[PDB]
Design a protein around this ligand. Sequence first.
Ligand SMILES: *[C@@H](CC(=O)OCC)[C@H](C[C@@H]1CCNC1=O)NC(=O)[C@H](CC#C)n1cccc(NC(=O)c2cc(C)on2)c1=O
Ligand SMILES: O=P([O-])([O-])O
Ligand SMILES: O=P([O-])([O-])O
Ligand SMILES: [N+]
Ligand SMILES: [N+]
Length: 181
Amino acid sequence: KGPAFEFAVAMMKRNASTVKTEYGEFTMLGIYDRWAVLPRHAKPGPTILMNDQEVGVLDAKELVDKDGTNLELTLLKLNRNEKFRDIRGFLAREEVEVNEAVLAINTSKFPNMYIPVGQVTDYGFLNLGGTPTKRMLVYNFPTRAGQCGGVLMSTGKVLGIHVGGNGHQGFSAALLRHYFN
Ligand SMILES: *[C@@H](CC(=O)OCC)[C@H](C[C@@H]1CCNC1=O)NC(=O)[C@H](CC#C)n1cccc(NC(=O)c2cc(C)on2)c1=O
Ligand SMILES: O=P([O-])([O-])O
Ligand SMILES: O=P([O-])([O-])O
Ligand SMILES: [N+]
Ligand SMILES: [N+]
């Protein structure tokens, strides 16, 4: 479990922020240039609060697959000068399964917390919040509101973004490299 945690802490420090939209408070991972990712249910408007600062949103893309099925991710392009360190090389081209993963959260409710969530399985199809959804990764741990946008990692890999769950079951949207240019 140790190297996953070492990787996770360094990744959050360099690429993560805390974001508020009108729909809640989230962990947000910057990906490259001015592109970042949120859960689709964050519903970012024309501005967001990023580390307590108003930042304009230049574009937002709610991702669906080639038949229009929800992936529960929104990509957003921010109006800011600082560029994210490019982490596209840490994103797989297809869903990753691992024996040990770490879920990293940074919000006002969960300030820099890391959770060893155990094994991650490619669950696939889920009806999530009433919406047919694909590319779900599942893991078993005691889930909580406020963990969405949390970053699911293993050693040297960013696997996905936490988007949902119930009870002791959590789900991430797989974060695939082709979603980005
Ligand atoms: C993160 C967003 C946030 O905090 O929202 C506040 C209301 C949460 C994290 C969830 C809460 C319970 N445990 C978690 O891991 N995400 C949601 O609440 C999402 C948002 C969406 C879409 N959501 C909404 C509605 C239902 C569910 N869960 C399921 O439908 C479900 C199905 C199976 C199987 O397991 N869960 C959900 O996650
Ligand atoms: O968040 P920011 O303000 O852009 O830094
Ligand atoms: O289905 P997609 O388009 O590949 O995501
Ligand atoms: N919003
Ligand atoms: N910390």
